[PDB]
Design a protein around this ligand. Structure first.
Ligand code: HEM
Ligand code: HEM
Ligand code: JRS
Ligand code: JRS
Ligand code: H4B
Ligand code: H4B
Ligand code: ZN
Lengths: 403, 404
């Protein structure tokens, strides 16, 4: 029942016992594995998730089974029985947010899980106020380049109404403009969201790196548009340690990776706007953002600058240009004094996290295909590490686009 | 949407549904509670139903399902089982089944070539010495002086109460790994045990990093016998770099023929415990895994020092830079020597084409994403962006316990 987990570089073995705490099914069955898929295909239930989560909280502060634990369980029962829902205490919300990050199987940054600033924005009643919270979050998290993990939590979902939602997938994203010639200027991942901004009254730029405005939505209201003041949005010009021409490419990226469209689930309560940020691992920018063919797709441009032979796969021009771009990202961030981690350092620290979690919890849910970096996979220790993937709560989830 | 897994390509935005998985009759390790896809290792009644299924596959493949010859073959199979407990394949059925087992292998990126496989029937083999003759013929044919050709040699199947035909070596060609007094390993550390078994069984060992191992071959109920491959049969490629002149001075080399020799071939309930198969290398197998794994030759640091990189800090990407050059050295050296090899870009491009072929022909293709994606430059290849469904179809190759 408990799976054996082996590391093939070192020959070491552990057993995951934590997986038995899973209450939520993933996409696999004994007939077929679907672990490579990106997205997923009443009082009694809420009450039991609420109890489990409260048990988790009192166990975390070592006060499991005390009177405060007992009376808090009664408070939750009393509230659900009367209202069909309940509310979290602030410190509970703080615990739940850290735990949702801890439990995220696709996150390689989890050694940092215990260090998270939690902003309680549950007293927010308008899109305008959402914006103020978001701006303070950005300023805090950015901290002049010395990035600090943060989450801001807007009011929970309520059965009698529409959700608070941030329409953007990230707080900072570059616009993508579809052209008459069918190409895309800017970031092709953000075409649809750029078009929505324009529909809701934004005057668009014409650059490759136009920071998008935010579409913020209070319950049952049309989303409202807010331009982030450019002084809040820290960006890094990309240059190269040895290649002088690289800077001429005019490439840049923003400092703050801040996911804004996922749902935060704690004790059966759902927070549909709960944006969170940390700092980048270099491959996210250098490899995926700039090199993906359905993104900025710069590989060929860069290789031609390097005067590589582009005529054939076997000169490994792609691999060569990809390394230089990742190096440029590392160099430029370090030069601009902005927090960044390379994929070797991050995966080493992830291995340590796995060992920490083994001792603490008897395992760690991990999604191998997301943990292993998108260049030089087997050069990192996580490649050689077997991993068990499963869903624990508190959790982050995907949710439908609100349009 | 259809009641079958939906499979997306995220580069292109295209969708398919896998209906082939419905044909799987064997459970993998995953459940609704937990995914275990990253784990490397996983009577007459049972046999008869596997047999019937295989015979139906055979007759469907020649477009003769339901026909007299199909029903007669079925009757023939159950009569043979009813009186002996086993049965035997016709020659053309073995050929079909071998190719099908390769086509069904979820972890193989080379499957576009599945229809082109030379199937050597060695089901008459009766000694360890004859296994050696068969293996030498396979190696010569497959190597073809560098113009490599896919091949499989099939020795006799498991029989009840009778011992197995086994090749102890994991591949027909492997380098020795000698444990040193300083605790280190000279040669390939993956091969420490088999090397030590060969010496026990009377091999006089070398003292190099690239000593070709002898074969340990086991006929039914006999102790295994040792056979040295005549060196003229084992094609090897000395490694050099196109621009970095000192690379050749490292004395690195690899062999031409990747020939897996310890896997079990299952066809219709029948188990062929000895059926070595071979193709040609994808360059990352050698340049990235065999040469750069910390637990293999582990040459990353040596090469990066030669390249004069800053090995004191992760963020110089010294590991990534050296790896790329080692991989380019592998491609270049194999090309120069005119030995068949394919890079990870061309290999994955042709695997996508294979996925498209199989969608039309069978309605899906079992594929293990973590194995299909190459170990350098993953997201630079098109398979990274392709969702995959993994399941077990039969005929199949299986891992089997080491015989010692
Ligand atoms: C502190 C620095 C952090 C680093 C270096 C980091 C790194 C990463 C990486 C590389 C991924 C895979 C993303 C992709 O390639 O699409 C990821 C995913 C994820 N991270 Fe982290 N992360 C950090 C902080 C955080 C924080 C603060 C949270 C929440 C509080 C978080 C929650 C998540 C979640 C839920 C995912 C999965 C999202 C998805 O499926 O796209 N991470 N992270
Ligand atoms: C024609 C050129 C071929 C290429 C380039 C190729 C490539 C590969 C690669 C890269 C793997 C992943 C293994 C690893 O990295 O450890 C693999 C696995 C596999 N291949 Fe292929 N292959 C070829 C031919 C064949 C042939 C002829 C067969 C058998 C008839 C075959 C059967 C298998 C099987 C059963 C596996 C999974 C077993 C394992 O190694 O774990 N391949 N192949
Ligand atoms: C907090 C944090 C820090 C960090 N360094 N990195 C991250 C991952 C995000 C940024 N770099 C990529 C990830 O973006 C998150 C969104 N995931 C993209 C895949 C996806 C999801 C849902 C629907 C789709 F259609 C597609 C988070
Ligand atoms: C026929 C063919 C052609 C080709 N290019 N490539 C191949 C795969 C083999 C060679 N390059 C790596 C693979 O070797 C397969 C053996 N390893 C499987 C994993 C494993 C399991 C148990 C214990 C272990 F130590 C390792 C086959
Ligand atoms: C299809 C496949 O699952 C998809 O391309 C995944 C693979 N691994 C990944 N890993 C990370 N970290 N981020 C990603 O976006 C993806 N994409
Ligand atoms: C832990 C993980 O399952 C293991 O290291 C796998 C990953 N992917 C692989 N992919 C291939 N092609 N070959 C391998 O040996 C491995 N090793
Ligand atoms: Zn699975």
């Amino acid at each position: 029942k408990f799976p054996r987990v082996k590391n093939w570089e070192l020959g070491s073995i552990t057993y995951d016992t934590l997986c038995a705490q899973s209450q939520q099914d993933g996409p696999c069955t004994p007939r077929r594995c679907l672990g490579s898929l990106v997205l997923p295909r009443p009082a009694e239930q809420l009450l039991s998730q609420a109890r489990d989560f409260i048990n988790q909280y009192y166990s975390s502060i070592k006060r499991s089974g005390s009177q405060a634990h007992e009376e808090r369980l009664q408070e939750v029962e009393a509230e659900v029985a009367s209202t069909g829902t309940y509310h979290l205490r602030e410190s509970e919300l703080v615990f739940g947010a850290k735990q949702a990050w801890r439990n995220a199987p696709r996150c390689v940054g989890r050694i940092q899980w215990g260090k998270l600033q939690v902003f309680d924005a549950r007293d927010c009643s308008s899109a305008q106020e959402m914006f103020t919270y978001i701006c303070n979050h950005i300023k805090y998290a950015t901290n002049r380049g010395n990035l600090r993990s943060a989450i801001t939590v807007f009011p929970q979902r309520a059965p009698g109404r529409g959700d608070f939602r941030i329409w953007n997938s990230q707080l900072v994203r570059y616009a993508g403009y579809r052209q008459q010639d069918g190409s895309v200027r800017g970031d092709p991942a953000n075409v649809e969201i750029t078009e929505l901004c324009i529909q809701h009254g934004w005057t668009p730029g014409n650059g490759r790196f136009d920071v998008l405005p935010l579409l913020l939505q209070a319950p049952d209201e049309a989303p409202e548009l807010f331009v982030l003041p450019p002084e809040l949005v820290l960006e890094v010009p990309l240059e190269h340690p040895t290649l002088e021409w690289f800077a001429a490419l005019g490439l840049r990226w923003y400092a703050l990776p801040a996911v804004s469209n996922m749902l935060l689930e704690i004790g059966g309560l759902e927070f549909s706007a709960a944006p969170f940020s940390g700092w980048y691992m270099s491959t996210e920018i250098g490899t995926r953002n700039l090199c993906d063919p359905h993104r900025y797709n710069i590989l060929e441009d860069v290789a031609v600058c390097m005067d590589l032979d582009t005529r054939t796969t076997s000169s490994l021009w792609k691999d060569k240009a990809a390394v230089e771009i990742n190096l440029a990202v590392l160099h430029s961030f370090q030069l601009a004094k902005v927090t960044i981690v390379d994929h070797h350092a991050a995966t080493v620290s992830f291995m340590k996290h796995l060992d920490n979690e083994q001792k603490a919890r008897g395992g760690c849910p991990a999604d191998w295909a997301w943990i292993v970096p998108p260049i030089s996979g087997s050069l990192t220790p996580v490649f050689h590490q077997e991993m068990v993937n499963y869903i624990l709560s508190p959790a982050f989830r995907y949710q439908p686009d609100p349009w």
